[PDB]
């Protein structure tokens with residue numbers, strides 16, 4: 001499987017999109033980015049021009065105006081127009097994001113200090129997922145020869161340290177996955193950047209997110225609410241596979 | 257020289273707050289240097305569990321030299337303690353005490369023609385509550401805390417159940433520290449409001465009060481509403497921890513998300529409380545060095561009032577991923593976009609003030625122009641974050657860290673430096689050397705941009721907040737960010753040298769007004785320093 005959902009060295013952009021929701025985030029952000037880069041360049045050029053043009057050596061007698069109604073009207077309305085426009089594209093995207101559709105696959109995720117527990121209620125599958133290199137796999141949250149060996153054995157490399165877990169959440173491609181998220185002890189937060197999803201795992205609450213993965217591969221997230229000493233050490237691995245490979249994985253878990 | 261601390265005069269209290277804020281500021285900046293040392297490269301090299309087996313002093317010095325990864329058992333608790341310490345010191349014990357307690361106490365009475373604050377004895381008490389709170393915050397660092405170590409690794413906002421389950425009593429000391437801060441701020445606000453309303457000079461109508469005095473007045477109202485709410489939030493944590501309540505514990509029927517609503521109801525106002533006095537300072541400085549009166553005085557006052565009011569109805573945009581319904585998310589998104597208008601507009605007014613003026617590029621003016629740039633860069637990323645669908649990706653990443661360091665942290669800091677260079681002659685009778693002021697500005701300006709701009713890239717690439725260590729792919733921009741922090745720190749050490757030089761052997765100030773005619777508020781009609789008893 002191709003490692004897709006990961007940070008890349010020296011990266012400045014988003015992680016690759018692997019869901020329609022992530023795609024909408026990339027587009028909306030790209031749209032707002034153009035606008036805010038314009039605002040920033042505009043304000044910067046204005047400051048720099050003003051300082052050159054009205055420097056005391058060049059403009060020896062200062063003006064005294066404190067008003068310009070047409071300008072004050074223009075500079076109030078224009079911001080309002082910009083925000084209404086952003087909100088016009090932004091609200092539908094939010095609605096798509098937060099309206100939970102009918103699930104093809106249901107996973108219940110529970111955050112613990114410091115690991116994730118996964119349950120597939122339709123399949124009677126449950127398991128826990130620890131960082132490769134956590135005390136659970138014999139390590140102590142640092143790279144070592146033993147840890148590199150375990151990463152390799154699991155189908156990864158030294159570069160996936162802090163991201164790769166001993167077990168992955170496996171799902172079929174092009175299917176609607178609904179994830180139900182809660183926390184067992186403190187608040188954690190479950191996320192996969194490539195899917196455009198994030199949901200706090202609050203003890204006593206069950207919250208829902210959805211994604212539909214549009215290509216197969218390996219996608220990582222990391223716990224996104226400070227939860228104690230090993231907050232930095234409880235990541236998320238999702239493997240998106242064919243329907244048949246997903247079935248095969250399901251059968252591997254079936255006890256006869 | 258211990259009749260300094262028992263003084264009740266607003267000018268002496270102002271000076272104590274400024275010096276104390278600067279010293280706490282140095283401690284908290286030092287934490288960020290240590291933080292950026294650990295973040296400079298992937299793998300943990302400094303915060304090793306092995307350093308715990310030494311003494312407190314021996315452990316300290318060992319932890320400043322890097323170890324091979326094979327010899328360094330990562331200690332996540334230390335990271336969490338440092339960043340919590342950094343955030344709490346800055347938000348409660350540094351910038352507000354410097355701006356509100358320092359410049360607020362010193363200059364607001366001078367700006368409105370008041371001889372002193374309404375309750376001078378209460379003003380002195382507010383200072384000592386600040387100091388006691390600071391001491392408790394610092395003590396908490398060395399108190400039995402989480403994971404059988406010292407200190408609270410819980411984040412500056414103290415989210416339960418993490419904060420309520422942290423072992424030891426370090427967290428209870430931290431909560432007491434914040435109670436004392438809040439009390440200091442409330443006493444301050446009571447003084448500022450009473451003085452502003454009752455003790456103005458004859459002729460000094462409300463539409464004639466200088467903008468800085470207005471900024472302090474609006475800030476004071478925000479404190480009176482916001483700080484009692486915080487006091488409730490954290491007492492509820494203290495009772496969950498010590499007195500059997502279950503406000504935020506599901507086993508007893510509580511909801512951790514309730515704490516978040518109460519905390520952030522204080523927490524948003526808090527950031528406007530920080531930056532509002534800097535707005536006041538920027539207005540005075542720009543008018544002075546542009547040699548031109550402030551553009552739209554009344555719109556500036558009304559914008560500040562509007563921001564102050566609207567700042568109470570936006571809190572939950574800090575909670576977009578906490579489990580808010582679609583309706584709640586949509587409302588808070590709308591409200592957040594609204595408050596953005598009068599906020600961002602002020603940038604245009606400050607540019608218009610410069611426009612057609614006669615600009616002198618002295619040190620204070622440089623800080624003010626830097627402020628305009630940084631506040632814009634920080635403000636625009638706020639715009640991105642307001643859109644709840646995009647915040648889904650950015651929330652709890654370094655993109656948020658970049659946002660608030662630009663818009664708030666550096667905004668407050670550039671306001672502080674603008675004020676110090678502007679006013680140090682007036683306060684001390686000694687003038688700073690101009691070439692050093694400018695060198696300080698450029699080192700800080702370059703360093704701050706190198707520190708925080710790359711954190712946008714880290715955030716976009718999905719780097720989470722509050723992490724001791726990170727996947728190797730985040731290495732490049734963490735390295736650059738850390739170099740920027742080291743340069744900024746060098747600039748701050750240079751600054752402290754500049755202040756020391758200025759106060760011991762700086763050029764004697766001889767004029768009441770050593771700037772120009774367009775510094776037209778009342779402190780400039782007094783001597784430098786002003787008489788023990790003014791007006």
Ligand code: HEA
Pocket residue numbers: 039043079080082083527528530531573574592593595596597599600601603604631632634635636637638639640641642643647650651652656659660663664665667
């Ligand atoms: C100085 C204090 C300050 C200010 C003024 C702002 C300004 C803004 N902030 Fe910020 N913010 C913080 C301090 C501040 N922020 C802090 C401390 C945090 C996080 C705390 C923590 O978690 O620890 C935070 C986090 C934060 C979040 C939560 C992010 C997350 O945790 O996921 C959000 C989301 O809505 C947000 C939005 C905004 C917006 C829309 C603005 C806008 O008001 C900005 C206004 C815009 C500009 C200044 C741009 C320039 C504009 C013009 C020149 C013209 C106007 C044009 C238009 C409006 C189009 N901020």
Ligand code: HEA
Pocket residue numbers: 274275277278279281282285288289291292339340342343344346347350351354410411412413657661664665666668669672704707720721722723741744745748
């Ligand atoms: C005003 C508030 C403020 C200020 C000034 C700063 C200053 C700095 N901050 Fe801070 N920061 C916070 C508020 C602030 N921070 C908060 C609230 C958090 C969140 C904590 C949490 O996670 O719970 C945070 C978190 C935070 C992080 C993320 C930690 C994590 O997620 O793990 C980082 C990362 O590098 C960082 C770095 C820095 C650096 C390098 C500086 C500086 O070194 C930048 C350089 C600036 C200077 C050298 C100037 C210093 C001058 C003063 C402070 C004024 C002193 C007073 C007088 C002179 C009178 N900060």
Ligand SMILES: CCCCCCCCCCO[C@@H]1O[C@H](CO)[C@@H](O[C@H]2O[C@H](CO)[C@@H](O)[C@H](O)[C@H]2O)[C@H](O)[C@H]1O
Pocket residue numbers: 046065066067068069071075604607608611
């Ligand atoms: C959103 C972008 C923000 C950027 C802000 C910077 C732009 C500021 C431009 C100000 O424009 C000036 O305003 C003056 C006042 O309105 C005008 O003076 C006019 O009006 C004065 C009376 O107020 C008279 O004294 C003058 O003779 C007469 O020229 C002047 O022509 C005009 O150029």
Ligand SMILES: CCCCCCCCCCO[C@@H]1O[C@H](CO)[C@@H](O[C@H]2O[C@H](CO)[C@@H](O)[C@H](O)[C@H]2O)[C@H](O)[C@H]1O
Pocket residue numbers: 289293294296297298299301322323324325742743745746
């Ligand atoms: C004016 C203010 C100044 C503030 C102080 C700034 C001092 C910072 C210097 C830190 O020294 C570096 O630390 C790295 C660790 O981050 C080491 O990385 C190297 O050594 C490590 C083992 O110690 C390895 O794990 C790394 O991968 C490898 O690159 C590197 O050798 C060492 O020189």
Ligand SMILES: CCCCCCCCCCO[C@@H]1O[C@H](CO)[C@@H](O[C@H]2O[C@H](CO)[C@@H](O)[C@H](O)[C@H]2O)[C@H](O)[C@H]1O
Pocket residue numbers: 691746747749750
């Ligand atoms: C850990 C902290 C890091 C510290 C790094 C800072 C390095 C300081 C550089 C010192 O060099 C200074 O340069 C000034 C600028 O040239 C000189 O001022 C001289 O030049 C000025 C003109 O630029 C004049 O105004 C002055 O009167 C005249 O003394 C000054 O004498 C000289 O010592």
Ligand SMILES: CCCCCCCCCCO[C@@H]1O[C@H](CO)[C@@H](O[C@H]2O[C@H](CO)[C@@H](O)[C@H](O)[C@H]2O)[C@H](O)[C@H]1O
Pocket residue numbers: 689690691692749750752753754757
């Ligand atoms: C880690 C801490 C780093 C240390 C930071 C220290 C920064 C403060 C240094 C101030 O430097 C002084 O600046 C003066 C003002 O510019 C110079 O006066 C010089 O210039 C004056 C103005 O022309 C003359 O009248 C003087 O005689 C002439 O000495 C003076 O020489 C120079 O030393």
Ligand SMILES: CCCCCCCCCCCCC
Pocket residue numbers: 012013014036037040633636637712713
């Ligand atoms: C391929 C996308 C790369 C975009 C990187 C630029 C992001 C910088 C965001 C900061 C905005 C401040 C104006």
Ligand SMILES: CCCCCCCCCCCCC
Pocket residue numbers: 320321322
């Ligand atoms: C082989 C060891 C490499 C040397 C690195 C020097 C670290 C300097 C840290 C000093 C920072 C003190 C604040």
Ligand SMILES: CCCCCCCCCCCCC
Pocket residue numbers: 047051617622625626629
């Ligand atoms: C955004 C910061 C703007 C600062 C502009 C400084 C202009 C260069 C000054 C050259 C020295 C002449 C006095």
Ligand SMILES: CCCCCCCCCCCCC
Pocket residue numbers: 690691692694695698699702
């Ligand atoms: C009055 C003398 C002017 C001093 C200006 C100092 C410019 C130094 C810029 C250095 C950049 C720091 C990284």
Ligand SMILES: [C-]#N
Pocket residue numbers: 524527638
């Ligand atoms: C900003 N909140």
Ligand SMILES: [Ca+2]
Pocket residue numbers: 293294295296297298299300301302
């Ligand atoms: Ca490191």
Ligand SMILES: [Cu+]
Pocket residue numbers: 111112113114115187188189223224225226227230231234
């Ligand atoms: Cu976690």
Ligand SMILES: [Cu+]
Pocket residue numbers: 188189223224225226227228230231232
């Ligand atoms: Cu976590």
Ligand SMILES: [Cu+]
Pocket residue numbers: 523524527570571574
């Ligand atoms: Cu806020």
Ligand SMILES: [Mg+2]
Pocket residue numbers: 189224225651652
């Ligand atoms: Mg969060």
